[PDB]
Amino acid sequence: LHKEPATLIKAIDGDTVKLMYKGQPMTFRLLLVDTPEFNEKYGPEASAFTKKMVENAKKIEKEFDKGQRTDKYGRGLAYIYADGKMVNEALVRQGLAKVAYVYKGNNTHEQLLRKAEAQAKKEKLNIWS
Ligand SMILES: Cc1cn([C@H]2C[C@H](OP(=O)(O)O)[C@@H](COP(=O)(O)O)O2)c(=O)[nH]c1=O
Ligand SMILES: [Ca+2]
């Protein structure tokens, strides 16, 4: 896979952000993760983490996987990087998302994210507390 430029319109919640992609405003859903909804436990924290991570970055990039690039709701599906650091991975490592929605052919970073999740579990962080 490779990174390509992304243009942030605004953060939405733990695992969605609004990008301008080819001049279209689109919701993008982070691959391989699930954060709580905003009004569930750790939901405000996951939202705040993703929001600061993407807003405070000099640069965000996106990386499509090999399969579907949009879901059945018309959301973009990508890994998102902020100054080179994967948001999807950082959420799982901090126990603010579970690894989830793992579909064959869009699962390149599965093992990387499972490694982070196991460490968040070992440390009993957030969701795993
Ligand atoms: C992350 C992801 C979610 N989805 C779908 C699965 C769920 O559909 P169903 O709604 O039919 O249960 C939904 C979860 O999104 P959210 O976790 O954003 O609510 O989005 C995909 O189709 N592909 C994906 O890669
Ligand atoms: Ca979610």
From Swiss-Prot:
Residues 109-125 have a biased composition (Basic and acidic residues). It is found in: Secreted. Residues 109-129 are annotated as: Disordered. Ca(2+) binds at residues 15, 34-35. The active site is at residues 29, 37, 75. This is Nuclease A. It comes from Staphylococcus aureus. The gene is nuc.
